[model samples]
Target: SMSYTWTGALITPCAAEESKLPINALSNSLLRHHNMVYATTSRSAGLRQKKVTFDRLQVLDDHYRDVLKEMKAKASTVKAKLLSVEEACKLTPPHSAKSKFGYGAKDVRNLSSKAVNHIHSVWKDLLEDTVTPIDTTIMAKNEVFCVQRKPARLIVFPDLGVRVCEKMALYDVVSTLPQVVMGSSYGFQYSPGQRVEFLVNTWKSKKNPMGFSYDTRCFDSTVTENDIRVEESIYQCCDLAPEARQAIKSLTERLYIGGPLTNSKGQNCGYRRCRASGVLTTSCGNTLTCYLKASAACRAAKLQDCTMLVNGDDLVVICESAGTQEDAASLRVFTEAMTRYSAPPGDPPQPEYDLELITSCSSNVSVAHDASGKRVYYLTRDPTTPLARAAWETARHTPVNSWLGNIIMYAPTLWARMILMTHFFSILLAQEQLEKALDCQIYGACYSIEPLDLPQIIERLHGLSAFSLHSYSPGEINRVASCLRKLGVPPLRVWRHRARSVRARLLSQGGRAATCGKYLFNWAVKTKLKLTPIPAASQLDLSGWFVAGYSGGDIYH
Candidate 1:
């Protein structure tokens, strides 16, 4: 079936959009090549539409049924509870989009009488009419990056009212189901540190491990009606409440299966018969479908001792290798299996013998040494996108701070520590807002993180060794250096010189600001202050920091 059939109308924007990165006074301080930085706008929507609108083909065989049965068996052990209206409202991000029907995310969070009443009726209406196509807003995502990438991603979502209603119906199910069904393969349940640990441990467990990541071409567009119905049935195996069961089924038939797409200006852009990118089910649905297809493909390819790691549509597999020729052919067979299942590869998979060579979540494992000469492994990625996006974030006050998230996730990486921390903290210090809380997303959940608390956050999440880590792999260092040269970003020598200044300024302020200077900027000086475990590290509650992926699930914490 056609993924979408568009009307001739344009996908209009509600506000002014910029294609090139704006050169604010601070922008030049970090990145010299402003021309290389760009943001996606609605102007690129036509190109995105063309890329994503393609027919889907799926062929389920005995191997697919075998994997489905295995998944169902694991799912049956779990019971998902339906969330109440108040509980659901509390999970919503405060700044989520407003509903056309009078109410907003803040109102829902507050449990305002009007908002709660409307949500109740929305839930009731969902149960009463299962086949009516819900209205969804389609807009091109405004994301920043370096040169040579997609113009933009198009997001399709219903209004805030229906979103919260979705929370009430399906939030708990998404939160609980994936981990049980997918087990360690469920990627969102692990923090960056934990993910590295899992990958390393899995590789070590295998004899002659060979791994590769599968890049599903436009994963959301590859979603079919059969996939949606199939995922919902997986949830049905769970022991859910009667209302929860009905709502999940109705949601599958109505919103999940297909909907009308409206532009920002209320023009009817088209209709989507594929997965909606902004809904509670997006992450869970993608994970289940990807795991199902990949697991089945692994069996079809006759791969040995397969272990998969899935986060939404991102997938990587580590397994025992047969030989160079057999493993190469196995990857080809896997790609063919995924292609027939409607999730074709963008870049064809190739086997990697070195664990660090196979990238997942756009990151790979790398080696660094701590103070005691113990070899420490951490996750690192190509800095091109992070550095480019940070340049844009430095110039503009976007909703989520990608730099903060990168600092937390890639804490030990040289670029994240020396470059990102040095740049962003200097900017924050100038504004005298080190203690102010800013929002950042991690694995798709919004978190209100404070820059001043970073030392402790790093200590708790990445360990005290993050501050003392040195002798980063030559490959890792080269990647960051090449990215700097490519984007015209200042070199490491310049960043260290700048950090020395930032460190001095932070140290003078005392309190948490002083801690940031002492811990984070130690690289700027030859004689470093002794790094220690922060007393506050043990006190912070980071329980749900990495329990699940909620990319389009509308989650906040």
Candidate 2:
């Protein structure tokens, strides 16, 4: 018997080894790391399981451990010493089945005062909760990133990738099946062999974090640029061993995959309510179902013809969209990245997404008529139509849907989510980004926002966040910039230029700038992103009004 081999042309074998960043295939490795983190956090037991990732997961866990120790020590100073009848020396309670180990006052004090100073979460470490962050890294390629709430989980990834993450975990491919078969199953389940184009939220480099919490947005322009991180997501579905299939199948049988999944203290209907991931529901219900059916049909090759004793039980049909897989991937990426960037608030704002491609399909069926009034069958053929293409095109340019983008697009919303999410950003941002961004004087320093104050309806966010007070004035942009300088703080400007937008300025920095106005409007739509604004206006912010000089040369007051 003769066996044929590709002989190093483009094929590689799987390695049975511990994984790190894996430098050469960094993106793939980062993706695999995302898989590992998702695997651990997807289930209740898995949520607390010991895990390691090259980036954020490990960073977060290390942060958590140090924080708890410091908090315990501070708590000791005021805690009443236990009293005893004969001897106060041995006032310790009898050990029980669930004994938590910790170092009392002396141990905490001895273990470097520096660590305590650096330890964030000192105030809330005792609470032992998850944290969510604002302005997370959507750490991938050209993909849309967003937070989503799913049944039994919160997801952070691109839409289609979210579905893949949920299905992989919900289906239990990692734990239930053999490696080879599991990998194969994964490949087939994601329809790897099909002629399909999947847009991923991939990072251009390896320094990017890989996950995010629900309730937060991803893809901010501040991060995700060339030398900075760039984001894209991968969408694929392949088969795994029968055992892996059984796991997801059984899990599906037990767990509800859709509908309202959030009921925690600050979360109303999955995480931070509509303020974060928009109103959560199964699309236009019936129309959504139709979309699902269409996606299911498109993905038919994966399910129908499998043999080899795998068809043992009653089959269940679930319509999954690649977009949902993207969503799942985006969720994980959002969580991982936000966890690092925004400092992931408590329980890592879990966002869930399912594999249903409703965004690409519709139920608006109509028979076609020609100019001669002849009837023609107008059955929809390609689901990825021109409209979908346009959306993809727009998604490439904007940062509104993902974690980083949302933070960039709606920084105020990011502020609202952190306040409501698991206190992670509240603690981490204070320790990491905010303290650095504001140099610990964040209070009293004004930040700008879109000329809108989104409703402060979320219970936790009602009063904790604020939008720019002077966003409406014509010279508001220059005035705000001047105020930052005057206040002796870092100046952060946002210019929506009628004469040469900030994006254009950066794109052509050092070159003779455009005549200004014509280029601004033309390029604004193409580079739908935020960049550091140039302090252009010569004006005084008098009583919240930006006073600028008119060309006619009269102080018209």
Candidate 3:
């Protein structure tokens, strides 16, 4: 048994220990920080665990009545059609979970008898059986972290059939209704640009205005059975199909009212006594109730010049400050009013001494630069999740890349354009799928997006100044650095180097591909080229997709 010694050419040494960051391997990288990721079972988590037993407790006053009336009028004008089975199915992602009925996503897509028949039966049951609560699947969703490794957030969504049913019953209404009732205050209606503009304008409009964000402790769980009924009441006020009405009512009672909680191990984890995620009404119901509560609470607190911006459970208030001492006390009164209205903040709301200091939607206005050395104002957030998801995408296919949504939402941000776009596009280019269009959800609805079209999309959404931005706030830079460190991601310099190589390749391709590289990487070039608007932007049903003002133009559809 003479074992021949392996020669140098054929043999590889245990790679240098320095080269073995667990983050380097594709599979190990995903789970490298897994221990740091934990479920949120903190004070707020315990709060969500408790049940709200009461009903009809919210008193609808003149304000609520007025808002409801306005919403009904707007809903009446909305001509929403039931999505074709094929259309609805198209919205279903290829990476979506399989059904317990023994049908995989690919099988469903191909319209196999088992899958198609089951979907039809589900729709039929939604139209006919209005009593049984639709069962929801609960799983832990890995989300980005801010503080300690936050726990994996639990996502409870119904099966594919119920999701389709939800679209037929509520999608159109939810889309049109919130913007109507909440008006500009509807957080989802504004793009990142508009949001920053609103904040800036509001601050300028007032003298010493103080702003603060209010966090509701487990807002979804706080939604009681009555809360669901109240939301239905508002929907019933609108003119809807007879079947739609019945379906909405049925969905409210069964799924929205809470359902059985099952773990991944096939154990009955007990019953959920609160609102679940993945329901059509979750975002709509939360926004409506949150506004109602906040409106009443504002009146109750008697805060002067109260204006609110709300997206689901996240809320921010900007009002005239009553001096330093008085504003502190005023926040207390506001907190009291909110708690009485059944929306208590997770922690006490803090008053921002200045407008620029205030943060909402987990985003803050940050200044950056372009090739022309001009300052650009854009919304920025810590890129922790985007980096983590990008790393995850390197290993596995995700239903949707979290980075894409962030880029769309914060297209003007320096980090989004410089790092996110660079890294994502490089990956897509490597996979040779530059021409492939992907779907991403913005403001609660899904839209088809093409990576090549991002230049046009960003310009239309964020303005051409988005391409010229250069500088970023220290706070934002610091956070981005911290995020990269914690996530074990490469530094900005690494992304810049990768982007230069990627950009050179893209530019060499010519046509739209070259134009994309030019617009996105213009800052890297000294002699920047003039870019034109996307021809498709004019003909596209680009309405209700953007921030609804300025660069977005009129939504023709």
Task: Give the count of colliding residue pairs in each prediction.
Answer: 0, 117, 12
Encode model 2's per-residue lDDT on 182-279: one tens digit a residue: 12211112211010112011111112212121222221111111101000000002233433333333322222121222221212222111111111
Worst 10 residues of 3 by lDDT: 548-557
Alpha-carbon TM-score of each model against the true structure: 0.98, 0.19, 0.81
The RMSD of every model to the true structure, in order and in angstroms, is 1.1, 27.4, 10.7
Top lDDT model: 1
Question: Model 3: per-residue lDDT, tens digit, 200-250?
Answer: 888777777888888877676566666677778777766678777887888
Candidate 3 ranges with C-alpha deviation above 4 Å: 1-87, 102-117, 144-147, 264-267, 369-375, 438-441, 444-448, 482-498, 531-541, 544-557
User: Of the candidates numbered 1 and 2, which has the greater TM-score value?
Assistant: 1
Candidate number that wins on lDDT, 1 or 2: 1
| C-alpha positional error of residue 221 in candidate 2 after TM-score superposition, expressed in Å | 36
- What value of lDDT does candidate 2 attain over all alpha carbons? 0.21
RMSD of 1: 1.1
lDDT of each: 0.91, 0.21, 0.66
Native-referenced Cα lDDT, model 1: 0.91
The deviation in Å at residue 8 for candidate 2 is 63
Model 3's TM-score against the true structure: 0.81
Which candidate gets the maximum TM-score versus the true structure?
1
